[PDB]
Symmetry: D3
């Protein structure tokens, strides 16, 4: 793995944004070669989305030839509901960039046949040529997307029932009432994300420190699904200092020593300008 | 994984039997489409076998188009010995159902060339089109079949030497005397079981609690081979309350919360019998 | 796995050499069927190499139809530098046997495009038909080759930065100065070694006991890369008594009970003399 | 230990209040025999205090002959600051009951000589004949009072610098700003609390589950100071369902099986009314 | 601690019996200086008791000036019931030796006031001048006496409710049926046994290997009460090979290396004969 | 505990020397009030001793009224042997300072009655009024003095047989011959050191990182005897960066945050000069 460590949230968000920017630009997508991006929702990636929007407005980055696939969506919640992930993505990112609406893909949590919706989502990813870069986060319980503890590490897109940690963490978005949070969600599987050519997990905050420790210091375990990426060929973990609190000093020293090498991934910072 | 938790052994046994019954009936096996079933032995699956027999006698389930593959058998033990797995399967299941003898497969622990017998077993599984549902259990050492601690997690069928825990736990079936238990056994590999389309592990009793904890709470480790299924796409763990004693409260709460959903797998319970004529609207 | 336990380093070294000898002879390589051998460097395998040379000098074993691929090499060290792995292999093994120079392959730590060199190495392995038997060791930090803690368990050949652990352990080869040990190395990946048809890890000494315990008693974890072999179909660990100090009594008892069965792998000891 | 498990926060709060009520009433304190009660602050004991007040207003319980000693107080915060523990105790408990002001003791965080203030606090506890019942809570990091991870398990009252977890958890009381939480606190030691004749730890919420697990399922460790009570002769843990999420099923079943016996501690519920 | 390792149950039993024999003889008890011996029940000590009896019958050992205190007894069971510990001791030991009935002490689980009975037991121990040597065992749950997981490590003699493990282990002694096993028992506390001048724990069988590991390889933890003796000045653990299966090789090698030194404790073997 | 972290060995050594210096000077020992100092041997404390000598030579520190008690000594090795601890202390420290020989105390590993010599050592410590400051180190196996893994945590001075780790580590002083390292040693117990008013453990180097982790991050365990100090009221751990490699980032950050506070223990630095 590549463990990138920044001092604060803003810095981690920025590093992740710069990386995505460089990857898209250097990939140089076009009409016959789109850049496929897997995406997360939540407050963690918001900073990254904000920076990406800035780069776009400044004329340094374009999403015209980018296709996106979100990792999940709540089941039974109206799409127009302000707390739906469809609403989150549109209001916080898509409506602010030059991406084609038809090239953004989010699971339909109100589909008549939920499993059919999930299977169709997998087929869309396949039809798009797979995912080039899948950006994700880690839950307090170590989950990737909604692959709660005890999820098959080779799972595909399917319906999952939210665990206690997830409900408690999202209660705020639903009047602080636990029972208000949707009981289930449609989510890409651990295997679905593992199929991406590259995976970048953004982790910020002391509240994620223990989960990060479980995911990269302890072994492959289906109780902490992000641990599955220990067997992925190209995963990058981008975090701030607080998220590293539970890791061994030796580990952080090793990767901080590698920041000179890894910062070259974002410096120089490329642009579509000229 | 799907972790199913029942109150007692009888209920856990019954749930497993109902699931197998529904899977077979809904699979609807025929001459050109057999249902392949991997099977275990021991006191644990006995309750399940008894229920399956009950279903057969009641005329609700047929094994005519089912092929079975047992996970293991002792090396050097007389096939007619009351403790051989051949005898266990014949007396506790096969002789009570309508499965065809040519469709039941058990490793021959008395073959002169043991590895050849093992390789031939894998060939039979392949010829049958793979395993649709593999039923297994877990040892006190966390083993699947006889893949003792330290076994490759991608192993195929081969000869294995029984470890201490297994010998001691099985010493009761041989005059309660240790050295009387066969030293080796022929066993499907962890990889062999992993290749099944679905795996169902039945676990009952407080004496299996620690092994279950190691297998599903701790990570993938060849010291507790059932842990390999954390990387299988479709595994079901059926246990009774006592088997969950070493698990975290949070884990049990989560899965108990899913029992209403998971009971849909055994309710309704299907039958091969003709549909009721008097059904309206 | 098969865990072979010998009394002393000498006996462990010898068992490994006998096994390699039997495997090559029984494989019976020829002009259209070479025996591909993956190899390590270091004091641990030195004893094995010395025995292999003895077998050759005695006329019992030939490397004429053997192709070798070394696990790694330091980046930046002159090829003929006395501490380079090129030099270690030439002076401690190759020049004393009948293997053809063109059939020995070692990563070029002096290449300009390091990743291109690594990719070429992988192509050479593929061209040779893969590795029949990969011999390796375990670092005090549990590494295989230079796949330091935190390396992808499905990694391929690439550049890796040495961890402090490895730097400390190899400083004795560079005038005892840490600052003089090469900072990076080219190394086959965990996945590269896993692709071998058979893997034999030689481990000796109390200083390797904790790492051995981590690799075989604890689970699959990218922090102790040799643990990856728990998912390899045919891995053999060869150790001496001191290397077993951190294992459970039960584990050692089990494998010592299998020594009669496993010694059949080296007895009879075959010879090309008939 | 006695582990008491209730369904919700309200029920756990009530059980603790009933126990304190029964202990004081049966102790039957008087002008020459006071009941010494060690007390905590925070949101956790809030429900308990509210019940105790209800009991008093109903004429069922009197604190007239009760002396209290709070486990800690922030250094530097003006005593009258709304966030001082002096303020917390006065507004949430003391001003609502019949306890004598001169019999309530809280460490003076504004003293010039901090250690002298701490030593004086210990003298006062001794002068009062020790603590009959010390009520406490557990921090997310397993602390008792402000005996942060790495505190001597036989420590006495002294100055302690708050750890990260404590700062983050208490920031909500200071406009959600971490930089506003006092850096140090005066706190009774682990040994101070261990000297109490009986110790009752109140634990509620899923956010305390891991700490409880560390304190009672893992061993005596100064990293999780509540673990020290494993060597106390009379400690009672009162929690709600959510606080038991990280414990083994076996542990919870054992203690739930003892609830019939343990409920005799609060049933019947005594009253001073005659 | 002193960890004594014998090959089989019979050998471990004999070593234990020889040690008790030498301790009594060299102590040379008299009417004004009795030898106080703490004792356990169960199948583990059976072999030891048999040897002690042989020693007595051969005229080599006398229990005339020995006082015994058993660690526990079931509550609600008829004193003369075949499964009572009163009966176990009389049948398996007392009736076969020259000890005086007035000098054998066992908790009366049928006392009107159980707690008073426990306190009285502690008084008797003190009146006898304390316990010179307390012999015990270890449960599958690591318990000493009936100090089940979660028992105070400084507990005194009291009533305890049997845990799952203990129930399942004794169910066979009551028609293999679980509910038939007495729900409670009177037991000396961990502190009670810790007060002995010397403690000898006898452990045999692979079914005790995990508990032994928890008790001496992991740290002080009230979940495995025998771990408390890590803080006792003079404890001896006597086991057979099978009981050591879960321990680290290094630990067993260290103590097997001390067997020649420790055998001096039982060789020469003394006798009261002139 | 107080964990002091310095950059390298030299800095850690100096901090320790400065602290011992300040403690002695401020203690102001005299004819009827000696400063009792417990001392260790080995390469770890060498740097500290060198600095203390400098302070003496510069006329800033006097050992005239200081009494010393060394923690251990080899059994059976001639006192005149260059590697005896008597020789180590006199050649590396005592002969270079103004301490009175009669006030230096080291166990006699060649005494006729070893236990008597040990008991006599405890009496001398008591006669001296106990130990004011006991300076020690930690073994790779976490030992304090020669209280090898599996030593009673309340042990007194006695004979101990060295464990494999100690043998392997000390072999460097006996030409690298393991079998040349003395088999046994007389050593103060864990309890003996715990009785000191203050304990300072010096830990330097990556080879000690795991033991430090075991001693302060895991719990009280007789397998890692320095862990016993978790229950000491005043222990100070002085280490360098490399010794902290196995600790959690959170722990190191907490203590580095306290370095300005703890440096007040050595700044200002006092002198006997008026
Ligand atoms: O990230 C920098 C590299 O970008 C290119 O590689 C990406 O885009 C190609 C499509 O245009 C893909 O074939 C390739 O898999 C992507 O990684 C550029 O082509 C490289 O030179 C840069 O190293
Ligand atoms: O278990 C319920 C499902 O049963 C069928 O699916 C099984 O049998 C088929 C063969 O007849 C296979 O193709 C399939 O893979 C099996 O799962 C039924 O056909 C489905 O509708 C049910 O969901
Ligand atoms: O190691 C003993 C075996 O050697 C042969 O098998 C090896 O060499 C063959 C090439 O000639 C390969 O096909 C095979 O994969 C190797 O394992 C021998 O042919 C066997 O009989 C022995 O078991
Ligand atoms: O909690 C119930 C018990 O209360 C009394 O015991 C307490 O109060 C006494 C002072 O009045 C103390 O001596 C004693 O230590 C306290 O526990 C009552 O006196 C007992 O009968 C009850 O068991
Ligand atoms: O175990 C051998 C030792 O036995 C004596 O010590 C025991 O008995 C004495 C009473 O007679 C006590 O003072 C003492 O505490 C016991 O240990 C004998 O007196 C010693 O010489 C032996 O070492
Ligand atoms: O370390 C600084 C302190 O030194 C004194 O305290 C030491 O010396 C006294 C006399 O010998 C002892 O009573 C005391 O226990 C030692 O700690 C000084 O007297 C203090 O003021 C300083 O804090
Ligand atoms: C409503 C619901 O929650 N359904 C899920 C299902 O989608 C999933 O396949 C299975 C196993 O979980 P897994 O696929 O992660 O192993 O659990 C549940 O039965
Ligand atoms: C008689 C016997 O016990 N033979 C087994 C062998 O069949 C197995 O392949 C190997 C490794 O175990 P593994 O295949 O599980 O990795 O161990 C033994 O040498
Ligand atoms: C100079 C250097 O050290 N480069 C390596 C790189 O080759 C490797 O791919 C990556 C992840 O490590 P991994 O491939 O083992 O997961 O880490 C570094 O950025
Ligand atoms: C400002 C401050 O934080 N001071 C504390 C001090 O009061 C405490 O005695 C010592 C050890 O912690 P401990 O007493 O818990 O072992 O740490 C700090 O140096
Ligand atoms: C009927 C019964 O089981 N009573 C026990 C009691 O005797 C014991 O003091 C307490 C704590 O256990 P502990 O003393 O070991 O800490 O638990 C129970 O409430
Ligand atoms: C020659 C020798 O090594 N003797 C020691 C002895 O002095 C020590 O008391 C005992 C227990 O170790 P402990 O005192 O640390 O518990 O072990 C040995 O039998
Ligand atoms: N399923 C996602 C959002 O619900 C999840 O992957 C996310 O990364 C995690 O729950 C953290 O959410 P945060 O962004 O709110 O921290
Ligand atoms: N060898 C296998 C038998 O199917 C294994 O799964 C077996 O179930 C295990 O040893 C447990 O035996 P039990 O079923 O008798 O508990
Ligand atoms: N470069 C070696 C790194 O020290 C590494 O290849 C090898 O895998 C292992 O460290 C063996 O070293 P040894 O031979 O010195 O034991
Ligand atoms: N020092 C106490 C309060 O500041 C602390 O022990 C408390 O128990 C813990 O921090 C939890 O606080 P809470 O009551 O707010 O949960
Ligand atoms: N209650 C004790 C017996 O009186 C119990 O300590 C005993 O040592 C333990 O349960 C082991 O029993 P066993 O000897 O029957 O294995
Ligand atoms: N024998 C003790 C000291 O004399 C032992 O505590 C010592 O601290 C430990 O062996 C460390 O030795 P080192 O200083 O050589 O690392």
């Amino acid at each position: 793995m590549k463990l990138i460590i920044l001092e604060h949230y803003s810095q981690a968000s920025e590093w992740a944004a710069k990386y995505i920017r460089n990857r898209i630009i250097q990939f140089n997508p076009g009409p016959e070669k789109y850049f496929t991006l897997g995406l997360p929702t939540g407050s963690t990636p918001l900073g990254c989305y904000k920076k990406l929007i800035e780069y776009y407005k400044n004329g340094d980055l374009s999403f015209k030839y980018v296709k996106t696939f979100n990792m999940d969506e709540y089941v039974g919640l109206p799409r127009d509901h302000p707390e739906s992930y469809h609403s989150f993505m549109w209001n916080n990112f898509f409506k602010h960039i030059d991406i084609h609406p038809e090239n953004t893909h989010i699971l339909d949590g109100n589909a008549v046949d939920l499993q059919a919706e999930c299977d169709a989502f997998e087929e869309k990813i396949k039809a798009a040529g797979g995912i080039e870069l899948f950006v994700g986060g880690i839950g307090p319980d170590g989950h990737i997307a909604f692959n709660e503890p005890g999820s098959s590490l080779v799972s595909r897109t399917r319906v999952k029932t939210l665990a206690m940690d997830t409900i408690l963490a999202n209660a705020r978005f639903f009047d602080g009432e636990l029972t208000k949070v949707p009981t289930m969600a449609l989510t890409v599987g651990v295997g679905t994300v593992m199929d991406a050519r590259e995976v970048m997990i953004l982790i910020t905050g002391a509240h994620k420190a223990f989960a990060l420790y479980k995911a990269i210091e302890e072994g492959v375990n289906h109780m902490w699904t992000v641990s599955a990426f220990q067997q992925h060929p190209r995963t990058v973990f981008v975090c701030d200092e607080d998220a590293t609190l539970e890791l061994k000093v030796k580990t952080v020293k090793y990767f901080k020593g590698l920041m000179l090498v890894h910062n070259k991934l974002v410096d120089p910072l490329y642009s579509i300008k000229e």
